[model samples]
Target: QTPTGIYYEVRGDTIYMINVTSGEETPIHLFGVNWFGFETPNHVVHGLWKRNWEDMLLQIKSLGFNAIRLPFCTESVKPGTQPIGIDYSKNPDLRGLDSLQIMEKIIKKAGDLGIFVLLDYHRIGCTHIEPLWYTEDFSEEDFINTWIEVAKRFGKYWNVIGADLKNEPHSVTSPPAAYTDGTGATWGMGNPATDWNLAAERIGKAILKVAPHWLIFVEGTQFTNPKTDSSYKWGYNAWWGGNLMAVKDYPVNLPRNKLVYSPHVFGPDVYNQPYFGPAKGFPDNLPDIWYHHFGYVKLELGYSVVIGEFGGKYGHGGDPRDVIWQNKLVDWMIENKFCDFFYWSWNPDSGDTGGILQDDWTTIWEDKYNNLKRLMD
Candidate 1:
């Protein structure tokens, strides 16, 4: 009923992959990629329409990436939600499976290939971005219960690392859950009803009850420190899930070494910040900006802070500045020894930041691959 498998332990920004059979703790850095689709209406990975799912997992392994961040919505696990775009001839074994079954197959194959799977609860719909964890259709209890189910179901696999608590919990304003720090998903605000810090603590605790061996990855809220800062960009703000400034004052309690701070980051192609302007100093000024926002957890507190998602339309869309920015970002993360990260995606259909694969789905995007390869070696 519950997981009895290998699990990751977080110790001051260092993640040790423990061997259940051997009693060994192998400290590892996850150079990972996001393989999306279960979060969408399709109820499966996007590239299955053209390529074989097993081959895709093999390609991910062949590429030297040891981990995958699988994003899915609560709707994905429900019965009758059949996968839509798979070509059965290429994947005959997946001919008539529901979303959850498909996910199990994917995880099983990935594990056989020695790839770690990090489960991510990336909200309900692709077009839908609710301010907090619970949407009107799915209440907070529903959200927590769904995650409990996922942790119970998939934690048995050797490579099922853990759950990314919530994807990009963000809000420009929080009226009902009011706080001077910032409202929608306030961290360290001491409000259990709205604080992401407390919410992650609660949801993470629930997940661990059934899957105690799994790791708990928590992301940051969009904006914090609004009162002291001058403006959104100039003041303190990151992309939807990019701000972890509040963790210092109030950190989530996972009761042990289960917490890993996961933050999403991007470049100008995704959203233009004042820092990208020539007036403020384009990219030379970014290293320190990233440090204060989310890097401090790793740099100062010695906590594990991984970039849950980060990628942009580099040469894919011809944003040379973004190309430069992306380069600087990889360089900065390396310089700081913050090497554990999941590149935004493995699918090419992403709008702002394409992905590791081209739209054709069969070819590798070497341009993006080399930059990320900087961290691996």
Candidate 2:
């Protein structure tokens, strides 16, 4: 396990591994410029069609992000499907930069900096990923073969700590008790009752066949349980759903050890948590209700969990005092030992969702970062 009091970041060709205990940040590596790109346009993301990946990493490091979550589209990796353009192998638009090679260089640089990297296969659109294993015109056998290729590729990299088999999986394969809000479905594997075992059977077998040592992070259904009127009414203002774990007959086929239960927690709404009313308690003294929800994940889940995404617009035309309350929300997560969180975005262009740093990525709310660091500490 990585020692406590360590923080990592990449600063303009330099990788800094910080020893928070001694207040000393060490520069571990300084590789020249690299190239980077992504399919979707997200916060702090410009598609990278014009700039070099190495330069992008330096800029990202400067933004105080030690860890990098790189999303790779399936089309980018699979060959001979789309035209020679935009493909991982012979994409002319990519200017001869190999996708896998870029991944290697970027991941290695992160390792050199002593930073952790999580490889995410972000599925196109909001649909769960397993169906793609079937729809990409590839049989289950082909899907397994593809993962074998991936595991063999970066299995030895220490910094490549985990492999998120598929981004968000929400399909009809949910367990019997599974229910949706009719607006959307779950992401990644569905209910553990039915599809969970089947999905796990495929993914686990493939991952084990290749990179048996890497941690496998699996996401739960959109609504993990039966949506009851009471539950909905209680969290009415919030984006509450069913508990996916309640599905019967759904097997809990966890990927061997080193498996982490990865869940994305947004606000009561898919958007940022709105200021419905006044503050309930002080930053130091949160309401007992807050701890109840926090304790559920800590005790019930029995797995190392991360918020994945959490943060909202503090002063986007709202009350400045309200922003203070928002800051308190961040404090709650940190106070509860919630590490490994990616502020909704780093791009100001991402609209008024949640961005600790503004669009330019330079004007960051120092208080927010400090509060986040407290959680890591």
Candidate 3:
């Protein structure tokens, strides 16, 4: 529970946060937005960090969101990394603050506004690169150490409730080899070199040792092969971190309730999977595909799950299909009681998937935000 009075524990398939003194367990439904950009080289939301952050948080809170998935690059926390440069003309109060210092301010402000934060270790080096978690320079131990440091630094904060261990673990190869034997560099099982499950267990255990109260959000691989490689090939599969079929056999072994399976789903605007073809009739077939991919965590495994990322450029004259996709996906999440979800991003700079805010950065895209009201409700 850290220094805070709140503690979260999984009871059966449900997740609840308990107040130690009162013993009041409240069901946690994390409906929020993925705040990006600080994880990028700029170290702040692309164009809006000048003076709009606090007001932006207010707008998010006004929209009924109770949480924020604050993504960060691993290098931002490492020693000797450059400090974030702020535009003094826009916000003089933040003149000489570094990246980590700015992050501290963001977390403190968000907490003061009654918003919970889930820190997401989105990348390793400066950019978003392959094979899921590790890069050439950063080893698995480096990744683990980065998370341990984050847990040790921010674990005591009451509002900093969880850690998204990795962003999206995908493979460059389309179908890659069978993960059961663990032959590929992509996220897989049995292989400690690139297996996210093993890495999560190792890192999760280390983090929990220091911050037992923080939830561990684990994502799945991009591809999975249940049949023999000769029988069938992995065609177009779910987006990165969207495949969770392997979890049935290889589940993350973290402390109970501390493990939240997070899967990122994408619309046709992102990827044209076979499920989106006319034969399947777009969203009409999404349920079956979703169930096969990540939905089973709740139905079969009885584990808590959240849609860590799912959204598209609706306000920027996005494809009509994307609108149908988003609404349908939101309906499925609500119907299944997968109450916790965070949209792809909150920044206007997500080139592929636009955000809740418009190009102006400060104004909320009412139409897109309206579509997500069901999730917030």
Candidate 4:
């Protein structure tokens, strides 16, 4: 039996697979892909205009990925919020369906194909991530209500994994102020409103109230002033939702096995930080950066870390160093058993990192999939 250090815990005559409803005792890492659209202006997954939504799911399963992170905005879940941009000719089954109904169809089909789903509440607005989970239009109650409603709607299906409370929870602030009356999210520094750590507990506990079986994915904050946690200021800051140094002190308080630390990571293409220099570039430092941030939670402590998002330009007009950066990062994940992950996207529309699917929407990018095959093996 493959003893993958993260997703699957091998034991004698028993498999440590979670939420499977007997799907597999197999070392099925969450080798998933993020498909964003429900969170965008489209109010549904992109690329459906080009091909059947079922065809996309088939392609993902056929390519060997075991899961998908379906991201949606708070607005998409509201009643009568119809999903736009879907060409009914390409998707006959999705015809006349509202946003959540369309998602339910996708989730059911994915479950039938043995692919799990982690539903992400990506943003409150369609444009970009809000600095925190709450907005004036959708207050803290509205956010929690959306998650609770989602859990009520989609939590029963065996393949519907759980809720990702917020997407890339970050702030422009360097030394983040407490969520009390600030713009940034803090971890242990503590404020019922500003502390992402507490927010996760509140949201997750609320969701668990309805769907106790689902995993609660809590992502880390992006920035921390060296004055706050100087030990982790490694030449560069953590990627959005990539810093988790404070987790040891402020671990999310969810029921056992109900917590998964989801982190987002990007390479040179997204932001050409100093560590990715052409001359001074050192991709080797990535592993240590990962460890200091979120890796230690799984490797050093007893928790699971499913990289919520990690991908970069491999060949679609990318920096040469990004190719090396992706290879180094994937290699590290395989070795460290933090291989369970969701590649940044399935749609080609992400401006920074292109997706596993090419611009054609039906064509799969073989180069990226081949590189990721290491984790599946």
Q: Which candidate achieves the best lDDT against the true structure?
A: 1
Q: Model 1: how far is 145 from its true place, Å?
A: 0.5
Model 3 alpha-carbon miss at residue 34, Å: 0.6
**Stronger candidate by lDDT (1 vs 4):** 1
Error of 3 at 321 (Å): 0.7
lDDT for every model?
0.82, 0.46, 0.76, 0.79
Q: What is the lDDT of residue 19 in candidate 2?
A: 58
Q: How many Å off is the CA of 268 in candidate 1?
A: 0.8
- CA lDDT, candidate 2, residue 93: 34
Model 3: CA > 4 A from native: 21-23, 79-85, 177-188, 225-236
Candidate 3 similarity to native, TM-score? 0.92
Q: Candidate 3 on 1-377: residue-level lDDT in tens?
A: 55677776677766677778888878877888998766778765455544456777888898899889988887676544554545566756556666776677778889899888999988776566455566667777888888889988887677888888888877675454445434333343456766777778888898888888888888877764434222222323667888787777677778766898999999877877777777766778788778878898888889988889999976367667888888888889888888888997787778888888787777777877888878877
Judging by lDDT, tell me the better candidate of 3 and 4. 4
Candidate structures ordered by TM-score, highest first: 1, 3, 4, 2
Report the CA-based lDDT of candidate 3 relative to the real structure: 0.76
Write model 2 residue lDDT over 76-176, tens digit each, in one string. Answer: 45443222223233223344445455566667777677556666666542223343334435554665566667667766666665566655444344333
Once superposed on the true structure, which residue ranges of model 4 sit more than 4 Å away at CA? Answer: 1-28, 176-181, 224-228, 278-281
